[PDB]
Amino acid sequence: DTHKSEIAHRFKDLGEEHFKGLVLIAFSQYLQQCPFDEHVKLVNELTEFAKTCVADESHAGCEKSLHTLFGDELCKVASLRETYGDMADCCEKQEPERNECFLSHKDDSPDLPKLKPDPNTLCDEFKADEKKFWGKYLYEIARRHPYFYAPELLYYANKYNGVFQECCQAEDKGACLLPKIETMREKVLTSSARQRLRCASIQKFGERALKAWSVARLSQKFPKAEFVEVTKLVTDLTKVHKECCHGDLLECADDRADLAKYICDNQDTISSKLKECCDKPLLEKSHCIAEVEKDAIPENLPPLTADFAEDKDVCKNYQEAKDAFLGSFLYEYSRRHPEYAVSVLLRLAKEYEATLEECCAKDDPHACYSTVFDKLKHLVDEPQNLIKQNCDQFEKLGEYGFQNALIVRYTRKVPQVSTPTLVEVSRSLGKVGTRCCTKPESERMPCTEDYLSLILNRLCVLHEKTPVSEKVTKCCTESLVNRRPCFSALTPDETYVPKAFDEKLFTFHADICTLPDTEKQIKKQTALVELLKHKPKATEEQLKTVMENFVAFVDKCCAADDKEACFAVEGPKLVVSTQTALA
């Protein structure tokens, strides 16, 4: 009963272009510092060997796993040690330990040069060779995002050649291109942050957590899908993610297709909105199905309380399959409330779990769990007043001013975190203003809950690598679903000794007037953070004073005939007045 050669099953099923694409992504994520040219060699080689195993299945090595073959090739890289250190001892291990070891060196903050894309040299390179322009893009996104969802990477990379196909024929390439890549670039970062949380769930909270996520997400989109169908799409959707998150990129891709294919062939029992989606070429259909509008709530739905609170058999039901009965609750809940954010529904079910565990203990469980829904109904509203405040502060200050607002709020909160992580997180938190505060009122909170969890997950991820605040560790490990309130309930502690003053953190040169705009703000926001690790009690009135004092200074010195002499003299002046005002 042996369908023998895994490389050959995959090469056939995906076809060559997708095989090559996915292989280049996989090498790109394992070795992020490597030049492009070296990866193209590793891909072509493995690809030859793939064809040979399609031609002859018995030929040597054609039965080795996909890791072993991927792994064999990583081990032959002349520059693994003197380029990747401790990584080249992975080569001393056997399968599957050798593969675990490679993964664990994926770098979530790789140090990579910022692509300042220029449309002329860039439109130059797509005409020269469209298929390599295509690969270079794959490799550049994937090496800076090493857990990127890989079948989507091909999707976007095609969308991308798509822009150049339409824009390099116009009379102002520039004016045509940059708005489209920029709208594109935002969707890609959002999609990578999404995937990164999917993988954190499983790696850190179990398959049970991801799976539970898909019940929420699915039930909500496909409320007229009955539970067994939902259950089924869930099984196959957790598998696709598990494999994606584990670097099994070829199995993942092929299993997403089989699912895209299963969904479209079962429209009538799943949802009525898919008919347009179920009609594109492969990449686009899958993206369509993941982007698709939600279906209508069936009309005569039996009130929630029926099965889950009055049922004189709840505890019995629950004990016989805890996870199914809870999945069932999540299904039931999610399909009736497509308004809610997932993070919220998964928080509703978790609380619901906690209630049976402890009610089912007591002699009269029914007296205990009959009342759960009010408990639950109060969960929704805890968030709401957070929202109002932050959108006011946001409208009040604008995006930049709000980022510095968060930078201060979050540095007093978790002063130990490193300065680059505090900057990046606060910037991203502040864009949640622009994302969510112009939305309809009853929609602002769901929006907010949803992205915070991508952003809080990035904080944990950046921070689990080099663990230094106990506060953050606790909020990251304690729960998946309760991070946002765990991070909002944190206070500035008086258990933090201020950082000793460091001159080099508050010295500025004529370069500051040179930087790209993002860089300029990031240089300033760093110094903002370093100022609050040093002067952690400094008031809001005082900081107001410093920030203005600081704007004037940069303005002043970015205008003079000798800027260097201008920073030299005014720099120390600034330090003095600040030290005085704050100390």
Full DSSP string of 150-185: HHHHHHHHHHHHHHHHHHTTSS-HHHHHHHHHHHHH
Compute the distance between CA of residue 72 and CA of residue 1 in angstroms, rounded to an integer. Answer: 28
Short-list 494, 448, 453, CA closest to 476: 453
Which segments of 296-383 does DSSP mark as H helices, in order?
A: 305-308, 314-320, 322-336, 342-359, 365-369, 372-379
Residue recorded with tokens 């220029």:
118
Alpha helices in 437-539 (DSSP H): 441-465, 470-478, 483-488, 517-534
19 phi and psi, to 5 degrees?
A: -55, -50
Distances in whole angstroms, Cα of residue 386 to Cα of each of 230, 231, 444: 34, 35, 11
DSSP letter (8 states) at residue 293: P
Say if residues 448 and 471 touch (Cβ distance below 8 Å): no
Backbone angles phi, psi at 538, to 5 degrees: -50, 135
Cis peptide bond N-terminal to 223, omega within 30: no
Say how far apart CA 427 and CA 171 lie, in whole Å.
36
Q: How far is CA 411 from CA 247, 526, 538, 545, in A?
A: 35, 11, 12, 18
Residue burial 377-413, b: 16+ Cβ < 10 Å; e: rest: eeeeeebeebbeebbebbeeeeeeebbbbbbbbbbbb
Binding residues: 3, 6, 13, 67, 243, 246, 248, 251, 254, 258
Domain 382-493 has CATH 1.10.246.10: yes
The rounded distance, in Å, linking the Cα atoms of 53 and 266 is 35
Q: At the topology level of CATH, where does 296-381 sit? A: Serum Albumin; Chain A, Domain 1 (1.10.246)
Say how many C-beta atoms besides its own lie within 10 A of residue 330's C-beta: 27
| Dist. CA 564–CA 308, nearest whole Å | 71
The full 3-state SS of 397-457, as one line of letters, equals: HHHHHHHHHHHHHHHHHCCCCCHHHHHHHHHHHHHHHHHHCCCCHHHHHHHHHHHHHHHHH
Tokens 């600040």 correspond to 578
Distance CA 157, CA 185 (A): 11
Residue type, 182: E
CA trace torsion 259, 263, 266, 267 (10° rounding): 180
Name residues whose C-beta falls within 8 Å of residue 329's C-beta, 6 or more positions apart in sequence: 308, 349, 352
Distance between CA 367 and CA 359 in Å, rounded? Answer: 9
Burial of 68 (0-12, 13-18, 19+ CB in 10 A): middle
Q: Give the distance, in angstroms, between the CA of residue 342 and the centroid of all CA atoms in the same chain.
A: 15
Task: Bin 61: left if φ > 0, else alpha if -120 < ψ < 50, else beta.
Answer: left
d(CA 543, CA 537): 10
Spatial neighbors of 79 by CB under 8 A, at least 6 apart, are 34
Q: Where is the binding site for Zn(2+), in residues? A: 67, 246, 248
Please say whether the beta carbons of 278 and 264 come within 8 A.
Answer: yes
Binding residues for Cu cation: 3
Q: How many angstroms separate the most distant Cα atoms in the chain?
A: 84
Picking from 242, 60, 285, the residue whose alpha carbon sits closest to that of residue 154 is 285
Pick the CATH number of 494-571 from 2.60.40.10, 3.40.50.10420, 3.40.50.170, 1.10.246.10: 1.10.246.10
Instruction: Print the SS3 string covering 118-145.
Output: CHHHHHHHHHHCHHHHHHHHHHHHHHHC
Element (H, E) at 200: helix 173-205
Residue pointed to by tokens 């994937």: 142
Q: What angle do the packed helices 441-465 and 419-436 form, to 10 degrees?
A: 160
Enter the tokens of residue 513.
């007037």
In 3D space, the residue among 180, 163, 150 whose CA is nearest the CA of residue 287 turns out to be 150
CA-CA distances (angstroms) from residue 343 to 216, 336, 347, 389?
9, 16, 6, 21
Structure token digits, residue 491: 């206070």
- Which candidate, 131, 153, 128, places its Cα nearest to that of 22? 153
3-state helix, strand, coil in the chain (%, to 5): 75, 0, 25
The fold adopted by the segment(s) 1-107 is Serum Albumin; Chain A, Domain 1 (1.10.246)
Per the CB < 8 A criterion, the answer to whether 342 and 291 are in contact is no
d(CA 334, CA 302): 14
Residue 89 structure tokens: 């001892």
Report residue 193 as tokens.
């942050």
Distance of CA 432 to the CA centre of its chain: 14
State residue 565 phi and psi, 5-degree precision: -60, -30
Cα–Cα dist 1/209, whole Å: 34
Asked if 1-107 and 296-381 have one fold, the answer is yes
Output the CATH code of domain 204-295. 1.10.246.10
Neighbours of 271 (CB within 10 A): 23
Residue type, 175: A
Give the DSSP H or E segment for 71.
helix 66-75
Three-state secondary structure of 540-557: HHHHHHHHHHHHHHHHHH
274 close to 285: Cβ distance less than 8 angstroms: no
C-alpha–C-alpha distance, residues 190 and 148, integer Å = 11
Place of tokens 């070891």: 101
CA distances from 24 to 133, 194, 463 (A): 13, 22, 28
Q: At what angle do helices 6-14 and 249-264 cross, to 10 degrees?
A: 50
Those residues whose C-beta lies under 8 Å from the C-beta of residue 92, and which sit 6 or more positions away, are none
Q: Quick one: which of 387, 491, 399 has its CA closest to 442?
A: 387
Gap between the Cα atoms of 310 and 300, Å rounded: 19
CA 247 to chain centre: 16
55-60 own/partner pairs: CB under 8 Å, 24+ apart: 57/4, 57/5, 57/8
**Tokens describing residue 540:** 């809001």
The experimental technique used to determine this model is: X-ray
Backbone angles phi, psi at 89, to 5 degrees: -85, -15
* CA-based nearest residue to 184, from 156, 155, 146: 156
What is the C-alpha to C-alpha distance for residues 175 and 160, in angstroms, rounded to an integer?
A: 16
* Interacting residues of 154 by C-beta distance below 8 A, sequence separation 6+: 18, 21, 22, 138, 253, 283
Q: Which two tokens stand for residue 375?
A: 């408990």
Which tokens is 417 given?
């975190």
Chain position carrying tokens 């505090």? 422
Q: Which of 7, 6, 15 is nearest to 283 (CA)?
A: 15
Tokens matching residue 41: 């060699």
493: nearest Cα among 411, 426, 552, 427: 411
Q: Which amino acid is at 450?
A: D
The number of CA neighbours under 13 Å toward the Cβ of 335 is 28
What the block records as the tokens of 442 is 């009853």
Both tokens of residue 314?
């709840």
Number of H helices, E strands in the chain: 29, 0
Q: N- to C-terminal Cα distance for the chain?
A: 78
Between CA 146 and CA 32 the distance in angstroms is 8
Domain ranges across the chain: 1-107, 108-196, 204-295, 296-381, 382-493, 494-571
Residue 517, judged by CB atoms within 10 A of its CB (0-12, 13-18, 19+), counts as exposed
Residues contributing to the annotated binding site for Ca(2+): 6, 13, 243, 248, 251, 254, 258
- Residue 192 CB contacts under 8 Å (≥ 6 apart), including other chains: 141, 145, 147, 148, 149
Tell me phi and psi for residue 430, to 5 degrees: -70, -35
Query: Tokens 């990578």 sit at which residue?
Result: 192
One of 1.20.1250.20, 3.30.210.10, 1.10.1070.11, 1.10.246.10 is the CATH number of 108-196, namely 1.10.246.10
Place of tokens 């996915």: 22
**Phi, psi angles (nearest 5°) of residue 79:** -115, 15
Sequence-distant (6+) residues with CB within 8 A of 373 are 304, 305, 309
